[PDB]
Design a protein around this ligand. Structure first.
Ligand SMILES: [Ca+2]
Ligand SMILES: [Ca+2]
Ligand SMILES: [Ca+2]
Length: 404
């Protein structure tokens, strides 16, 4: 139906011979597994090698991942095996090419001979010290280590729309992943999304969870998921192809797997993360390049990752599979098996969830009256399983049943 793949990690830029050239060799495996969408890293010239400090946005040849021609071919290959491609869009902030008379880097260069994206400090937000105080105040949060772009500026909107239109029409990207989406307003995001008509979008809105005295996230995370639901409503709800990453489900699942699976049924009997309020708009995941990989800012318990996948890959939401977990952790076949269960049972983003049990050592759940998912160390559950259901997949801390 709709299965995402994050096609990179934090070390990818180092790849001998180039990341894109390397990933070319994995296109068939990705497509064959039932993945429908692959998320590739920011493609522009950037001060930082990973790509999250972009300067010359049209300058794809300066990317550490590989050059313009290589990206285009890689996107062509995914397209040839039916896979859509998502660009990591980093537009909250931008680095400037040249110093003004203050000696501050705030004269931008787009990477082309003409004046596209050749902004100056007037395009920087009002209170950002890289700027000159003439821009509008930031519509969202600030990123302290680079200039924040003033998205209310009319030249900015128009020229970023033109760049996205080139990423789409000429480079061949189909969809966007919005980096640091808290940095600018949903109204600003709506403008870019509506103007470019992507097949799919996902916002990265990452807010710290409120914790109890014991340092664990509160059982109640409604303020956390409400923020996600509010952003999606405000960009147009079902009149938009935009979703948000389910960082509520990530944060809860991180702790629930550690002998606390009762966290996976909220007060109202429903899932406690974004998928429990608006599953169609929730993009779930076990880890990404920030939370895991070599940054490990919020890692999933490493011994329990297949519990993570058993959950996201059978549940409502748009599940996203992380590169390392798929190719480097010895888990390819098990993940592939879960995706095929998902697809042949016709599980989809708005599928229906009925939580059966949620104890410390057990989480059990039926999806669309057709799949039952079990995670945790408790193995004896057959009295809890309805007649007609048979085990179709199992591993360390997980098992899946299908109806007949
Ligand atoms: Ca230029
Ligand atoms: Ca800034
Ligand atoms: Ca901002």
């Amino acid at each position: 139906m709709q299965v995402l793949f994050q096609g990179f990690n934090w070390e990818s830029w180092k790849e001998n011979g180039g990341w894109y050239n390397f990933l070319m060799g994995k296109v068939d495996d990705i497509a064959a597994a039932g993945i429908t969408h692959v998320w590739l890293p920011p493609p522009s010239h950037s001060v930082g090698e990973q790509g999250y400090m972009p300067g010359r946005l049209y300058d794809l040849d300066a990317s550490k991942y590989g050059n313009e021609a290589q990206l285009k071919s890689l996107i062509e290959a995914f397209h040839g095996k039916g896979v859509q491609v998502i660009a990591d869009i980093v537009i909250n902030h931008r680095t400037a090419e040249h110093k003004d008379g203050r000696g501050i880097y705030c004269l931008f260069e787009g990477g082309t001979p003409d004046s596209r994206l050749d902004w100056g400090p007037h395009m920087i937000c009002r209170d950002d010290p890289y700027g000159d105080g003439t821009g509008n105040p930031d519509t969202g949060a600030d990123f302290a280590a680079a200039p924040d772009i003033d998205h209310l500026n009319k030249r900015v909107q128009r020229e970023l729309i033109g760049w996205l239109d080139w990423l789409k029409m000429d480079i061949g990207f189909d969809a966007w992943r919005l980096d640091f989406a808290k940095g600018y307003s949903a109204d600003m995001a709506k403008i870019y999304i509506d103007a470019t008509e992507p097949s799919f979008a996902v916002a990265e809105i990452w807010t710290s969870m409120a914790n109890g005295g014991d340092g664990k996230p509160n059982y109640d995370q409604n303020a956390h998921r409400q923020e996600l639901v509010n952003w999606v409503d405000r960009v147009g709800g079902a009149n938009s192809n935009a979703t948000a990453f389910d960082f509520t489900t990530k944060g809860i699942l991180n702790v629930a797997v550690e002998g606390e699976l009762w966290r996976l049924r909220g007060e109202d009997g429903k899932a406690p993360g974004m998928i429990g309020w608006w599953p169609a708009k929730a993009t779930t995941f076990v880890d990404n390049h920030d939370t895991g990989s070599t940054q490990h800012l919020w890692p999933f318990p490493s011994d329990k990752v297949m519990q993570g996948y058993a959950y996201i890959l059978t549940h409502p939401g748009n599940p996203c599979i992380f590169y390392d977990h798929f190719f480097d952790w010895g888990l390819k076949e098990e993940i592939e098996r879960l995706v095929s269960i998902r697809n042949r049972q016709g599980i989809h983003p708005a599928s229906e969830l009925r939580i059966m049990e949620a104890d410390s050592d057990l989480y059990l759940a039926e999806i669309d009256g057709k799949v039952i998912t079990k995670i945790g160390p408790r193995y004896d559950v057959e009295h809890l399983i309805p007649e007609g259901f048979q085990v179709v997949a199992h591993g360390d801390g997980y098992a899946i049943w299908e109806k007949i």
